Design a protein around this ligand. Structure first.
Ligand SMILES: *Cc1cc2c(cc1C)nc1c(=O)[nH]c(=O)nc-1n2C[C@H](O)[C@H](O)[C@H](O)COP(=O)(O)OP(=O)(O)OC[C@H]1O[C@@H](n2cnc3c(N)ncnc32)[C@H](O)[C@@H]1O
Ligand SMILES: *Cc1cc2c(cc1C)nc1c(=O)[nH]c(=O)nc-1n2C[C@H](O)[C@H](O)[C@H](O)COP(=O)(O)OP(=O)(O)OC[C@H]1O[C@@H](n2cnc3c(N)ncnc32)[C@H](O)[C@@H]1O
Ligand SMILES: CCCCCCCCCCCC[N+](C)(C)CCCS(=O)(=O)O
Ligand SMILES: CCCCCCCCCCCC[N+](C)(C)CCCS(=O)(=O)O
Ligand SMILES: O=C(Nc1cccc(Cl)c1)c1coc2ccccc2c1=O
Ligand SMILES: O=C(Nc1cccc(Cl)c1)c1coc2ccccc2c1=O
Lengths: 495, 500
């Protein structure tokens, strides 16, 4: 066998960040990656037509200080996603341009309902500990309800319910009826709340990496050299002996003191364990699916939308639209003009049956309608990736928790199993689901091992992160009226 | 590589039934079984204290003609579970003995609510095709709510809601908020409806096999000889070449024309596929967990409950009770007196923290109160099995579907993937979740392959089963009043219309 200090299973950002930390501390690490590439749910494609394009995870923003620091160390730079001009909300067949992060409404009743919806998401979040959502005071009540049930209760207008539904679909690539309310509320809260998670300027979608996010994993692979083994899917982990034994599908055996599992939780099912996993993890990893998304990028000769004072962001309500959300994917120089759109949740399943060319046509026709421009019908290039197809991801962006699961099994996610510690963005406590969470979790799991080895104290397992100088966070603010305007039923109680 | 016609992955009842059918048709079959035993979610323990005991699947009954026929052919016999004396419904700390399958109520409003609850489960079920539940007219609406939501809408009394909750917990070893309403309604309907699924006499729990259900898989192994390979967990299936290659964990390669996957759907995740699975199956197998149950058998010197005119059946509502349901597990000879109980759904997780001895004590204390009998505190022996611990089962009894999954992914459950065909009880259309469904699916999958090989016509893939002459099925009937008594809101509507 091939002997080392730590085997890291998975060469996504999380596994790479863990391996780098352990390597930098002087341990001999091996990364076993199932695919013929690193990066996992990040994947940057290069060709002459696009130069580069992120087909997986791409955006970073303020408060994501760990991914920003790691990337900066590896020599990467960011640029801002274009949000100079107006955003579009397309509702009942018409485009309504706006500025600011939240799509506005004019009807007084609908205004109260929208205001109350967003406010309530954050109010509920304040009672959910980031590191232990199952300790929320109403954890059981909220976990035993889907987001569809919660929205049906909260939203007195169809307007609010449709936007709230889009919000859920876009955040977690899942239907409102598929996901626990507790989990979804936790998910938003642990990204810093509604404003932070939905915002381009001053939020999660503010920036992209120049040259693609795949460079994070690639450049850590560059550092580690032949310590990264590609096309080594892990099939078997044996902890019965002195050293942990890790076997791959291509018949290699690795021997280590400890293991980091840096794969999506459910993909633990692809590994046969000796001894068997404890009951709760055994069942947990069958209860935690990933979402469904096709990421689609349509290229144009110019960013023609900008001429009409549109930035390229479209929020598109309703069943008919294949894509509910877009961002300008143009490169910082104004070249490789492009619109990125997501085909979300059930639509990813439905539209997957079409050809690439058929999806292109549907997207272009949608964009022509929403941007009010025939230029949208003249694409120069198209790239897409359906993440539902991936054996070694299970979906994207991340794992969702159906009703009842987080309270019953949530504690299990990062609980060590003998000498196996658990990384992966799903185990993070801040921006779980994102590249930021991947770094947090990888580095925390690495430091758990350093602590197990007696190399650092307990209090250094979790480490704060200085704020990025390049991408500082501005405060999230609310107005007096936003804080104090009644809900619809609140207004009815007064009458 | 070890060459054959068909590799069957999994040596449970379904895989063994498939392998037997293929073997009997003259093909060369291999069964690759992960464990050191066959039977899977069936497991018959033998020792001197119990003689034999089913720790997994046990009960068979009328309308389950495939398992009955298979078992009979293998030389097995059944006996009736004891239901001579009164059943007990224990509610709010008190026991109420009764007869008939449904726990009764006296309060007229509660009576209407209970009657409407069961009726409505079956009314909704009649809308749902057994072979295509996603084709129900309101499939999407029903699949997008949990059973909790449905019961909250349907049950106008807490009495009905509590019993309905126990019904779901006991039927599918999952919480009402965990499971799709469409899927649960399908599940009940495809067992023949509420009466059939809940009944001992004339239903699913009528009988057990003399000597244990494990004998079904064991006796098929005896017929197959060395074709069954134990401690061969399958890790890899490669369909890129002319013949399918199937690799095991212990470093063996098998080569076949076709493969039958006879494992729980989610346990397909334990196999690496080349080429990758199609998208819909890739995601489906991460969305279909199994339920949670500890099966617990407490042994006594005598079946003392019978002397108080209790048959041993206890239906126990609420949170505090560790066990919500019991049956008499005494041998047909009248010895090895025993009570079988299930610890269900979240309680299987909660009470797994305890020792075996602590669980025995809590069960005995519960039974002593429910039976009003100090003798329940004097057990002579105890056996149990927590199926949540099993790497190669994932849980018991079966796979449940959370909201939204059956409509989006249900159609690919038994869709072949090139030369892989899908057996397992989960793919059955009649008594899916049960030993019966395991037989149906194994035999159907086997015949799919026979058809692919040009050995039988397409109309022979699905085959009806003659009714058992030993376990005849009484029809499910309703009374006029059961059919036409109003629901609680129906009564309220009548009240508003009268006074107008
Ligand atoms: C897919 C996606 C993701 C995404 C998103 C849009 C799409 C379409 N947008 C994002 C965004 O704009 N900003 C952001 O910060 N995140 C976004 N996401 C999510 C993001 O990509 C993920 O959160 C992150 O990449 C997850 O990283 P992590 O390291 O936790 O996980 P991973 O990338 O899945 O890596 C796991 C690796 O393990 C390998 N693997 C799997 N099984 C095995 C076995 N058995 N043996 C060995 N290796 C295994 C995988 O191949 C993978 O490389
Ligand atoms: C567990 C349980 C089940 C049960 C029940 C009570 C409990 C506690 N009560 C039942 C009852 O009274 N009556 C009844 O008819 N059914 C009852 N159930 C359900 C019943 O046991 C199951 O429906 C049935 O046994 C399932 O049969 P099936 O053949 O479909 O599935 P299986 O038994 O799980 O067999 C699968 C086999 O495959 C092996 N395996 C798993 N993974 C692999 C890999 N990778 N490679 C090779 N083999 C694999 C398993 O080890 C198993 O043997
Ligand atoms: C009206 N809707 C919003 C449909 C329900 C109110 C919910 S509730 O009355 O606040 O429970
Ligand atoms: C008057 C309110 C009573 C609510 C009773 N429950 C059973 C809670 C709901 C009835 C739902 S439905 O109204 O029949 O659709
Ligand atoms: O909720 C979001 N944006 C948003 C932006 C405007 C309106 C509404 Cl309702 C939602 C976002 C949620 O998570 C994401 C994850 C990856 C990429 C983009 C987003 C996103 O824009
Ligand atoms: O629903 C059931 N029984 C029942 C019996 C009486 C009252 C009520 Cl509410 C329920 C049962 C359903 O599925 C089963 C599966 C394996 C073993 C027993 C049962 C069962 O008794």
């Amino acid at each position: 066998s091939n002997k080392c200090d730590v085997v890291v299973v998975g060469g996504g950002i999380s596994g790479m960040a863990a391996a780098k930390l352990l390597h930098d501390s002087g341990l001999n690490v091996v990364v076993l990656e199932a695919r013929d590439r690193v990066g996992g749910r990040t994947y940057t494609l290069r060709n002459q037509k696009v130069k580069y394009v992120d087909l997986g995870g791409s955006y970073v923003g303020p408060t994501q200080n760990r991914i920003l620091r790691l990337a900066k160390e590896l020599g990467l730079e960011t640029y801002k996603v274009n949000e100079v001009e107006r955003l579009i909300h397309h509702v009942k067949g018409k485009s309504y341009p706006f500025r600011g992060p939240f799509p506005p409404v004019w009807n007084p009743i609908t205004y109260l309902d929208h205001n109350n919806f967003w406010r309530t998401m954050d109010d509920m979040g304040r009672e959910i500990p980031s590191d232990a959502p199952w300790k929320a005071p109403l954890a059981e009540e909220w976990d035993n309800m889907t987001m569809k049930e919660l929205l049906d209760k909260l939203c007195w207008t169809e307007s609010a319910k449709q936007l709230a539904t889009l919000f859920v679909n876009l955040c977690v690539t899942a239907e409102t009826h598929e996901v626990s309310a507790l989990w979804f509320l936790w998910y938003v809260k642990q990204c810093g709340g509604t404003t932070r998670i939905i915002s381009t300027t001053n939020g999660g979608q503010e920036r992209k990496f120049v040259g693609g996010s795949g460079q994070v994993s690639e450049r850590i692979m560059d550092l580690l050299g032949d310590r990264v083994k590609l096309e080594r899917p892990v099939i078997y982990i044996d902890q019965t002996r002195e050293n942990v034994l890790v076997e791959t599908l291509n018949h290699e055996m690795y021997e280590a003191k400890y293991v980091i599992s840096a794969i999506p939780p459910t993909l633990g099912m692809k590994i046969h364990f000796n001894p068997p996993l404890p009951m709760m993890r055994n069942q947990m990893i069958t209860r935690v699916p990933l979402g469904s998304v096709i990421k689609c990028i349509v290229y144009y000769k110019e960013p023609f939308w900008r001429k009409k004072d549109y930035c390229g962001t479209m929020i598109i309500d309703g069943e008919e639209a294949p894509v509910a959300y877009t961002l300008d994917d143009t490169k910082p120089e104004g070249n490789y003009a492009a619109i990125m759109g997501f085909i979300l949740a059930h639509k990813a399943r439905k539209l997957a049956r079409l050809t690439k060319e058929e999806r292109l046509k549907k997207l272009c026709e949608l964009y022509a309608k929403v941007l009010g421009s025939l230029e949208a019908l003249e694409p120069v290039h198209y790239e897409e990736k359906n993440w539902c197809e991936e054996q070694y991801s299970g979906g994207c962006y991340t794992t969702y928790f159906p009703p009842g699961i987080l309270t019953q099994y949530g504690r299990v996610l990062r609980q060590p199993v003998d000498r196996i510690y658990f990384a992966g963005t799903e185990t993070a406590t801040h921006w779980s689901g994102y590249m930021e969470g991947a770094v947090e979790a990888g580095e925390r799991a690495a430091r758990e091992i350093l602590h197990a080895m007696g190399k650092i104290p307990e209090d250094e397992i979790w480490q704060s992160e200085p704020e990025s100088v390049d991408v500082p966070a501005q405060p999230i603010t609310t107005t007096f009226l936003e804080r104090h305007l009644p809900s619809v039923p609140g207004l009815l109680r007064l009458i």
